[PDB]
Write a protein that binds this ligand. Structure first.
Ligand SMILES: Nc1ncnc2c1ncn2[C@@H]1O[C@H](COP(=O)(O)OP(=O)(O)O)[C@@H](O)[C@H]1O
Ligand SMILES: Nc1ncnc2c1ncn2[C@@H]1O[C@H](COP(=O)(O)OP(=O)(O)O)[C@@H](O)[C@H]1O
Ligand SMILES: [Mg+2]
Ligand SMILES: [Mg+2]
Lengths: 237, 121, 237, 121
């Protein structure tokens, strides 16, 4: 029947876990500052404030996922296209993930087999969002201890559209799961997915954004080697 | 002659704020990124107090707790468990493994320090 | 037959609304402090930190409702009784809300139609949450502008148990909804409830806590006059 | 003479932090708890800028928006709408009622101030 109810109840729990960790930081750092102004040098004070700011932006990401989820059940998610240099936009996304990247000892790359600029008629906000989700998963699922971890964006044109690839040194994705990771709420609940923040909404939102552009998304992955996500979008006008 | 505390949690954001409030009181702090790395450090020294997370890679806090109840010189060390595990069974299991106090996160840094002082006086 | 999935979807939207408001303050205050260190006197610094701390505590209450919701579905919510003086416990609750109440100029009062101590074998934490929940709605559903707004907890011994009443001069509860307000997710979607935060779980959690004690909860109220929430628990031993 | 800004939102917590940032730039701030009060104060002076929330008791922001472009003195007052209503047609309707810019909550104060400076040139 409709197991959707049980999947939404686990959704509630995941929301509560994703809210718990930033809130722990925000509460402890804010009350420490409040009780320690005489013991904080300026450098430590700004550092603690930045934790609050960074943790509150994790919560803003959670907020926007719940709103986008509302826009899926309502089938209301829309896009607004405009003439956009896609090279400057992927470069815009690697700067918004580079700090959170090196937080996990991971660099981000952007090769491009095609001359810049690459003009496409797309919704720059949502495509940037798609890029950030794939980049976020690249570092959120990088190999635990191993070094030189990276996530790479390769921009290219193929089959009468633009082909974006997001490749990483990840834990990998099993083949029994490669065909359902794009579904709402679904998450690989393996061993090495312990304290990993997770809604299971990201790739579903990504998929709907990509298809609204008239494109498709798919993945190729081998456990241990990493993952490659392919986004193909028509160029339009 | 300042007391030492071994701080064991997988999160750097958390270790930093707890370490800061511990040194306001003058304690030395030794950090461990997981439970196996923790125990490797109890071979080099013995602390006055352990602050322990539950959910960690490699070795979780529950198995750390019991290995401390095992070894003779670890037996008598106080352990505050500070964890996001909010279950009544999680606390009872942690308590039955020798933890003297379990505190949930989000936590109050000052309530946390009051319990730290209480277990060291 | 299952409207559950419908009410659970608006529950997600209500989580997002409750998440959005405190997060607006936390982000804006944190970034302001960070960029305004030379433009803050010490008092403004501390009060901006207090806003952050107080808004985090709103989020923590949100978090604890999702946790408690998980315990409701899993039928694992559990009380632990102690010998507890109820006169003291109810004062711990009115004090813990006296501040938030004064933010709306609502006075919290406690009258005990009996001699203290009131000894009963109850869960001191969970009964406190019950009192706080109903005292919290007494302030949150106060009449907007109003002369001398109050909320009163009335201790009593009736029908072989303890009768806790929480009366308010609030906006009142319409008669057609006096029954469903204890349902999960249920909120009276009126007009004077526009920008009032809520998930519709407080009373469902309150009702479950009180019944686990062997007691019952019910409400009397007329629109415009006020509300009286009745909580009756056996004394136990 | 400094520019005056009319600040209209039902939340005291919100107006406090917006007012503080406006005064950092040297602006003068006049506060309104709802849309009704906002118009009542506009009969007394004319601001150079209005910051407007949408959801308030008594009178909402959409109604304020329509009333300002019905009175010849007020049509030209630039309005920034700052609202938690991140709806897709919420913005379009605000823009068609005369708003110059619609900004969502949560917001960045610096971005909000860049936009405030921009309309005051
Ligand atoms: N780059 C990646 N490497 C490994 N696993 C991934 C990657 N991207 C997504 N996944 C898996 O797909 C699942 C669904 O992803 P997503 O919808 O983004 O969920 P979440 O919001 O929890 O990240 C996740 O559990 C994750 O295990
Ligand atoms: N003291 C009160 N006065 C008026 N209405 C109330 C009161 N307490 C509860 N209610 C109504 O009951 C409904 C559900 O309350 P509750 O379960 O506490 O959920 P929440 O407070 O999270 O919305 C609300 O719509 C509210 O209007
Ligand atoms: Mg952990
Ligand atoms: Mg408002």
């Amino acid at each position: 029947l409709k197991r959707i109810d049980r999947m939404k109840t686990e959704f509630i729990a995941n929301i509560s876990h994703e809210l718990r960790t930033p809130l722990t930081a925000i509460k402890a750092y804010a009350e420490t500052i409040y009780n320690s102004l005489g013991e904080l040098d300026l450098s430590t004070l700004k550092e603690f404030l930045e934790v609050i700011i960074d943790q509150s932006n994790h919560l803003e990401n959670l907020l926007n996922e719940l709103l986008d989820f509302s826009r899926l059940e309502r089938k209301s998610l829309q896009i607004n296209r405009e003439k956009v240099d896609l090279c400057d936009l992927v470069e815009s996304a690697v700067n918004a993930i580079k700090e959170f990247a090196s937080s996990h000892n991971v660099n981000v790359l952007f090769e491009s087999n095609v001359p810049c600029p690459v003009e496409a008629y797309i919704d720059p906000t949502r495509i940037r969002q798609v890029l950030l989700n794939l980049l976020n998963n690249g570092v959120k699922y990088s190999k635990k201890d191993a070094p030189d971890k990276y996530v790479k964006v390769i921009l290219d044109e193929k089959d009468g559209g633009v082909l974006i690839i997001v490749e990483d040194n990840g834990i990998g994705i099993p083949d029994h799961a490669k065909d359902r990771i794009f579904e709402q709420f679904y998450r690989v609940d393996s061993s090495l997915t312990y304290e990993v923040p997770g809604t299971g909404l990201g790739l579903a939102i990504t998929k709907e954004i990509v298809e609204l552009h008239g494109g498709r998304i798919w993945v190729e992955s081998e456990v241990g080697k990493g993952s490659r996500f392919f986004v193909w979008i028509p160029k339009d006008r | 002659m300042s007391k030492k505390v071994l701080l064991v949690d997988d999160s750097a954001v958390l270790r930093k704020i707890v370490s800061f409030n511990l040194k306001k009181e003058g304690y030395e702090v030794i950090e461990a990124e997981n439970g196996q790395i923790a125990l490797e450090k109890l071979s080099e020294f013995t602390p006055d107090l352990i602050v322990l997370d539950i959910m960690m890679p490699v070795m979780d806090g529950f198995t750390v707790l019991k290995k401390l109840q095992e070894k003779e010189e670890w037996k008598r060390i106080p352990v505050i468990v500070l964890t996001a595990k909010g279950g009544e069974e999680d606390e009872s299991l942690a308590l039955s493994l020798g933890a003297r106090k379990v505190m949930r996160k989000p936590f109050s840094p000052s309530q946390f320090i009051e319990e730290v002082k209480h277990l060291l006086n």
